[PDB]
């Protein structure tokens, strides 16, 4: 029974997971009390992927909730669908580092790693085969970023055969929402590269653009953003839980993506996202799903796919759809936009299809794009990092606790090497 254990780190990861465990609970017919008020046996047949038996026919999430201060977990518990979580996975410290990667990694965040490792081992012990580990966090703080990467390193050390994947909300090209996010991101990406199997980088600017441009959504708040992210998670993990004509687990996605082991930062996407008053004007068909999936202004990252070449593209479909139409559209987008595709990989598009769509929709589709355009994001973060580092801005908050300049230089060198690798594989020819 292949199954994923889930982890949220930081307040961004906690608020993302607090809606992810709502959308998959609604997919599997789980009321907030924890029971199963479902509609079919193909809602409980693979409910063990994310849930565990407790008592009285009640299902608990297999989720580990991490923070260095119970600020957002109080809101998670107080909100709806917050009483389904077991109150032993709420791992917290009394410190609250906040936006210091060093304080979340080396100092005070590092005495919580033993307890959260103990609870993660306890959750993984109740698993027959343990398909994967997934983590939601952000590269803009110290608890989501630093403690999250510490968790990734420890889990990769304990289980060096498992699909350890992360979503992570990456820092934005506009605004900052955090002054020291260049430092946090360039110290977190250095750990993401060597450890994670794949990372589905999410950008809040792209989410805001999706909310206004594609969903109208005059007052979006963070609920619709977390809903879009959670729908992307559910579409990624759908074929692990529901039957389909072409199943695809996370390992199958990892095989039909990253070709060279240090290139696993993907731009995710979702379809259909129809406007607030355009449903009688839109046509819900497979070509329209394909068009909105491959539309450049529909990704949940702020990296333009037309400024680079798609290495690989994973299209995960859900619903009653004809495979000839699906494969015809997958071939047709490459044939009509062959400029944004590497010639040395024939058929860059992995295709998966499942039979069970989300409730209320006939069809759905998720985009996962490995392109040579996330180098724009890494170039942005590298430039914003070196501008601060050439004048030693905010470096005393790291050197005082115990960091040195060597870690910063190693992280910058590795990240610029990643940028050069992406540029090389963009400029590589067929022969």
């Amino acid at each position: 029974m292949r199954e994923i254990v889930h982890m949220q780190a930081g307040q961004c990861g906690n608020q993302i997971g607090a809606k992810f465990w709502e959308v998959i609970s609604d997919e599997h017919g789980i009321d907030p009390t924890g029971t199963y008020h479902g509609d079919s046996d193909l809602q409980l047949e693979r409910i063990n992927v994310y849930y565990n038996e407790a008592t009285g026919g009640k299902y608990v999430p297999r989720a580990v909730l991490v923070d260095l201060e119970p600020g957002t977990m109080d809101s998670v518990r107080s909100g709806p669908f917050g009483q389904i979580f077991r109150p032993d996975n709420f791992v917290f410290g009394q410190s609250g580092a906040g936006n210091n990667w060093a304080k979340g990694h080396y100092t005070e965040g590092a005495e919580l790693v033993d307890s959260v490792l103990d609870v993660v081992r306890k959750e993984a012990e109740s698993c027959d085969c343990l398909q994967g580990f997934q983590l939601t966090h952000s590269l803009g703080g110290g608890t989501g970023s630093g403690m999250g990467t510490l968790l990734i390193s420890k889990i990769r050390e304990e289980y060096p055969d498992r699909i350890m994947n992360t979503f992570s909300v990456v820092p934005s090209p506009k605004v900052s929402d955090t002054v020291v996010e260049p430092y946090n991101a360039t110290l977190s990406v250095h750990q993401l590269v060597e450890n994670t199997d794949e990372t589905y980088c999410i950008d809040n600017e792209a989410l805001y653009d999706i909310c206004f441009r594609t969903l109208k959504l005059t007052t979006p708040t963070y609920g619709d953003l977390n809903h879009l992210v959670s729908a992307t998670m559910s579409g990624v993990t759908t074929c692990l839980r529901f039957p389909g004509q072409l199943n695809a687990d996370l390992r199958k996605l990892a095989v039909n993506m990253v070709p060279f082991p240090r290139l696993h930062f993907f731009m995710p996407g979702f379809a259909p996202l129809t406007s607030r008053g355009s449903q009688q004007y839109r046509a819900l068909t497979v070509p329209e799903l394909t068009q909105q999936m491959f539309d450049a202004k529909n990704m949940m990252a702020a990296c333009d796919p037309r400024h680079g070449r798609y290495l690989t593209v994973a299209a995960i479909f859900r619903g009653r759809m004809s495979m000839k139409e699906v494969d015809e559209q997958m071939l047709n987008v490459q044939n009509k936009n062959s400029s944004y595709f590497v010639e040395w990989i024939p058929n860059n598009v992995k295709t998966a299809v499942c039979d069970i769509p989300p409730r209320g929709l006939k069809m759905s589709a998720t985009f996962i794009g490995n392109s040579t355009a996330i180098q724009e994001l890494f170039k942005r973060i590298s430039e914003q990092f070196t501008a601060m580092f050439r004048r030693k801005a905010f470096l005393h908050w790291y050197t005082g606790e115990g960091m040195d300049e060597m870690e910063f230089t190693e992280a910058e060198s590795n990240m610029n090497d990643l940028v050069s690798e992406y540029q090389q594989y963009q400029d590589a020819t067929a022969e």
């Binding site: 907030p32 009390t33 119970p70 977990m73 909100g79 009483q83 609920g223 996202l273 209320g360």
Partner: protein, 49 residues
């Protein structure tokens, strides 16, 4: 908009003026514990369990 869906979930906080939290989690002396279970939710509304 009965199915949940992305974008089909409006603002539930509109009109509310009291957003008081409650400390559900607190170290007792050195052990982390859930000190809640009787504390209400956001704004003092009653929980389920």
């Amino acid at each position: 908009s009965l199915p949940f869906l992305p974008g089909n979930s409006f603002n539930p906080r509109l009109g509310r003026d009291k957003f008081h939290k409650s400390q559900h989690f607190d170290y007792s002396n050195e052990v982390p514990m859930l000190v809640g279970g009787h504390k209400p939710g956001i704004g003092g509304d009653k929980l389920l369990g």
